[PDB]
Amino acid sequence: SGPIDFWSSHPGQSSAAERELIGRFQDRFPTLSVKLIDAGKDYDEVAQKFNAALIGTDVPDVVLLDDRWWFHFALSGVLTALDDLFGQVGVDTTDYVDSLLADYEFNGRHYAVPYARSTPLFYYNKAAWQQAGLPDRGPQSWSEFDEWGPELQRVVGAGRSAHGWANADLISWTFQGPNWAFGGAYSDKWTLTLTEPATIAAGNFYRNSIHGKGYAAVANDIANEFATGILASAVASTGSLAGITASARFDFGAAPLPTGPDAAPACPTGGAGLAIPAKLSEERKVNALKFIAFVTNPTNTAYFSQQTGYLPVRKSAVDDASERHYLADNPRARVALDQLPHTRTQDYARVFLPGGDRIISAGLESIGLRGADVTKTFTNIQKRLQVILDRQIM
Ligand SMILES: C[N+](C)(C)CCOP(=O)(O)OC[C@H](O)CO
Ligand SMILES: [Mg+2]
Q: What is the CATH number of the domain that holds 115?
A: 3.40.190.10
The long-range contacts involving 372-378, CB below 8 angstroms and separated by at least 24 positions, are: 374/200, 374/203, 374/204, 374/207, 375/195, 375/200, 375/203, 377/203, 378/194, 378/195, 378/199, 378/200, 378/203
Backbone torsions φ then ψ of 221, nearest 5 degrees: -80, 100
- Maximum CA extent, the chain: 62
User: Among the atoms of ligand 1, which is closest to the Cα of residue 269?
Assistant: 14
* Residues facing residue 253 across a β-bridge: 124
43, 175, 358, best to mutate for ligand 1 pocket (most atoms within 8 Å of CB):
43
What's the gap in Å between 30 CA and the centre of ligand 2?
18
Q: Whose CA is nearest to atom 9 of ligand 1?
A: 271
DSSP per-residue codes, 227-248: HTTSBSEEEEEGGGHHHHHHH-
Query: Using what technique was this structure determined?
Result: X-ray
Bridge partners for 96 per DSSP: 314
Using CA atoms in the order 10, 13, 15, 21, what is the torsion angle rounded to 10 degrees?
-90
Nearest ligand 1 atom, CA 119 = 9
Resolution limit, Å: 2.3
CA 182 to chain centre: 21
Please provide the distance, in angstroms rounded to a whole number, between the alpha carbons at the two ends of the chain.
Answer: 40
> How far apart (Å, rounded) are the C-alpha atoms in residues 149 and 15?
36
Residue-number span of the structural domain to which 204 is assigned = 1-394
Q: Residue 284 CA: which ligand is closest?
A: 2
Rg of the chain over all Cα atoms, to the nearest angstrom: 21
Q: Which residues contact 156 (CB under 8 A, 6 or more apart)?
A: 128, 131, 162, 232
CB 11 within 8 A of CB 310: yes
Q: Report d(CA 114, CA 295) in Å as an integer.
A: 11
Angstrom CA distances, 343 to 71, 116, 273, stand at 20, 16, 18
**Of 262, 261, 264, 287, whose CA–CA distance to 276 is shortest?**
287
CA of 270 from ligand 1 middle (Å) equals 6
What is the Å distance from ligand 1's center to 311 Cα? 12
Q: Cβ distance 144 to 209 under 8 Å?
A: no
Cβ(222)–Cβ(234) below 8 Å: yes
Q: Determine the residue type at 233.
A: S
Half-sphere exposure of 288 (CA within 13 A, CB side): 32
Which strand (E) or helix (H) includes residue 113?
A: strand 113-118
Report helix angle 142-156 to 197-207, nearest 10.
10
Length of the chain: 394
Please give the Cα distance from 100 to 121 (Å, whole number): 18
Q: How many CA atoms lie within 13 A of 366 on its CB side?
A: 15
Helix, coil or strand: residue 161: strand
Asked whether 350 and 176 are in contact (CB, 8 A), the reply is yes
Residue of the nearest CA to atom 8 in ligand 1?
271
Strand partners, 277: 79
- Residue 206: half-sphere exposure toward Cβ, Cα within 13 Å: 38
Q: Whose CA is nearest to atom 10 of ligand 1?
A: 271
By most ligand atoms within 8 Å of CB, the mutation choice from 173, 307, 340 for ligand 1 is 173
CA of 303 to the centre of ligand 2 (A): 27
Distance CA 350, CA 358 (A): 8
Which of ligand 1's atoms lies nearest the C-alpha of 272? 10
CA separation for the pair 28, 326 (Å, rounded):
25
Which amino acid appears at position 378 of this protein? F
Cβ burial of 44 (10 Å; 0-12, 13-18, 19+) is: middle
Distance CA 362, CA 183 (A): 22
Q: H-type helices in 216-318, by residue range?
A: 222-227, 241-247, 282-295, 298-308
- Show the ligand 1 pocket: residues with CB < 6 angstroms: 11-12, 66-68, 116, 118, 173, 237, 239-240, 270-272
Residue 226 near residue 236, CB atoms below 8 Å: yes
Distance separating alpha carbons of residues 27 and 249, to the nearest angstrom: 38
Burial of 158 (0-12, 13-18, 19+ CB in 10 A): exposed
- Count structural domains, the chain: 1
Ligand with an atom nearest the CA of residue 13? 1
CA nearest ligand 1 atom 1, residue: 11
* CA triple 161-346-387, angle to 5 deg: 100
Q: Classify 6 as helix, strand or coil.
A: strand
CA atoms of 181 and 45, how far apart (whole Å): 31
Ligand nearest to the CA of 12: 1
**What's the Cα-to-Cα distance from 293 to each of 54, 78, 244, 338, 360, rounded to whole Å?**
24, 20, 29, 24, 34
Q: Which helix (H) or strand (E) holds 66?
A: strand 62-66
Closest of 318, 276, 326 to residue 301, by C-alpha: 318
Q: In this structure, are residues 91 and 287 in contact, taking their beta carbons and an 8 Å threshold? A: no
